[PDB]
Amino acid sequence: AISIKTPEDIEKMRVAGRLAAEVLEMIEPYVKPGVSTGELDRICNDYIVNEQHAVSACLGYHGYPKSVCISINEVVCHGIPDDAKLLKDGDIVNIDVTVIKDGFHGDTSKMFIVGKPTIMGERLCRITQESLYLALRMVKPGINLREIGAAIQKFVEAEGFSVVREYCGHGIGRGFHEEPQVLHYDSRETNVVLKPGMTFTIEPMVNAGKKEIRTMKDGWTVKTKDRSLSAQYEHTIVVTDNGCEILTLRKDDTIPAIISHD
Numbered sequence: 001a002i003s004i005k006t007p008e009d010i011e012k013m014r015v016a017g018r019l020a021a022e023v024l025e026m027i028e029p030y031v032k033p034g035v036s037t038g039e040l041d042r043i044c045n046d047y048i049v050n051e052q053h054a055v056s057a058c059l060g061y062h063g064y065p066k067s068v069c070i071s072i073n074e075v076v077c078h079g080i081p082d083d084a085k086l087l088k089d090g091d092i093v094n095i096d097v098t099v100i101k102d103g104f105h106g107d108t109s110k111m112f113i114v115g116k117p118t119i120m121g122e123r124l125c126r127i128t129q130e131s132l133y134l135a136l137r138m139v140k141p142g143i144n145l146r147e148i149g150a151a152i153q154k155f156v157e158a159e160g161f162s163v164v165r166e167y168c169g170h171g172i173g174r175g176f177h178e179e180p181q182v183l184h185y186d187s188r189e190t191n192v193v194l195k196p197g198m199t200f201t202i203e204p205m206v207n208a209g210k211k212e213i214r215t216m217k218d219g220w221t222v223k224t225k226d227r228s229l230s231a232q233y234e235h236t237i238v239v240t241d242n243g244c245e246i247l248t249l250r251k252d253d254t255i256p257a258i259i260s261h262d
């Protein structure tokens with residue numbers, strides 16, 4: 001079944017979420033032309049281990065070889081940090097972090113635009129983040145995840161973009177991926193009504209082109225089949241009595257931590 005976090009667990013999630021968000025805030029200045037994704041990963045891991053006294057939940061997860069996932073341009077997700085992969089002017093890059101602290105996971109990612117942004121890159125990232133934001137604003141007890149997934153897809157598709165179907169958001173807590181699955185599109189299979197205390201992620205993967213993807217032969221790197229740009233933003237949240245609280249909010253987020261309804 002689905003778990004409803006206790007006040008104590010929610011506090012631990014706040015701590016874990018804050019740490020994950022802080023890794024993204026910390027790494028930002030390093031995401032510039034010339035840097036390798038491999039070094040960004042090491043910088044993130046050193047910070048997580050030595051500064052936050054936490055641990056990356058990604059390393060070893062289903063065999064994932066690195067500490068954080070770094071995906072560039074057409075790479076949709078699971079990009080493997082490589083000391084030989086350099087960021088360049090115009091690149092859009094997603095750094096996805098998941099830390100475990102005091103037994104709980106904080107999961108979040110954001111897009112970084114490297115050097116001079118390309119209007120398409122800016123547009124895709126902005127729209128992708130806005131799709132996450134619109135979804136967050138819908139979160140509150142009584143709402144069905146199907147409605148949220150449908151809303152995300154409708155928005156994204158109205159922009160001329162597509163939503164990746166192979167991946168979804170997820171419940172989170174002592175487990176990296178717990179129930180329920182949080183699809184970012186409309187599916188007849190989705191029937192999960194939100195309840196206070198639920199902690200999960202919303203992390204839409206949006207392609208500028210077609211939805212189809214391909215996994216490279218390193219068994220991890222996923223790219224858009226048409227090699228169009230793909231962007232993703234992710235936040236871990238806790239459903240409150242009248243909305244939700246974003247546990248991985250950053251200083252650069254343009255949405256409040258506490259979203260209240262009435």
Ligand SMILES: O=C(O)c1ccc(-c2ccccc2Cl)o1
Pocket residue numbers: 058061062063064069078096107170203234
């Ligand atoms: O939920 C996430 O944000 C996420 C990022 C990477 C993964 C993942 C999924 C499946 C196998 C390995 C990994 Cl690292 O999951």
Ligand SMILES: [Mn+2]
Pocket residue numbers: 096097098107108109203234
């Ligand atoms: Mn993630």
Ligand SMILES: [Mn+2]
Pocket residue numbers: 107169170201203234
């Ligand atoms: Mn996630």
Ligand code: NA
Pocket residue numbers: 071072073074075076077092094229230231
């Ligand atoms: Na991408």
